[PDB]
Amino acid sequence: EMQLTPFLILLRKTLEQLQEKDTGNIFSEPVPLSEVPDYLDHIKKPMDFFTMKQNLEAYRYLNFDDFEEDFNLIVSNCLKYNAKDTIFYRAAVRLREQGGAVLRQARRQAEKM
Numbered sequence: 228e229m230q231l232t233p234f235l236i237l238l239r240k241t242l243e244q245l246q247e248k249d250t251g252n253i254f255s256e257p258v259p260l261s262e263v264p265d266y267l268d269h270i271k272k273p274m275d276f277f278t279m280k281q282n283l284e285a286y287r288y289l290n291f292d293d294f295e296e297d298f299n300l301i302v303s304n305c306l307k308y309n310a311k312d313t314i315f316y317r318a319a320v321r322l323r324e325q326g327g328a329v330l331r332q333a334r335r336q337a338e339k340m
């Protein structure tokens with residue numbers, strides 16, 4: 228089955244592709260709790276692309292499903308916290324759409340390995 232190194236290269240490229248869909252850069256660093264003091268009274272597990280990069284390099288993603296789970300958390304946390312009539316909520320909807328396409332293609336390339 229798969230060698231670890233090519234899979235990690237693929238997750239690195241995929242994470243880069245997902246982060247470039249975040250043109251507002253509202254998903255690339257942890258939500259700043261000092262500015263949003265009630266954030267964790269609603270969000271059980273915050274996630275963002277910088278944390279995902281840390282997890283990737285700590286070897287915490289060894290299959291696609293776990294990588295995709297943390298991406299889905301970025302989206303679902305934002306949909307949960309923010310009202311529907313906000314830029315944030317709509318940006319999460321857009322990321323879900325555009326990121327889903329990136330992830331389907333990355334899964335296809337992994338299925339070659």
Ligand SMILES: CCn1c(=O)c(=O)[nH]c2cc(C(=O)N(C)Cc3cnn(-c4ccccc4)c3)ccc21
Nearest residue numbers: 252253254256257258259262263304305308309315
């Ligand atoms: C509505 C809750 N919220 C979400 O729900 C969401 O999905 N993304 C959010 C993204 C930000 C955001 O501006 N960041 C992550 C950039 C940043 C990182 N540090 N500082 C900072 C630090 C010190 C002072 C000023 C700013 C800003 C904010 C809220 C967010």
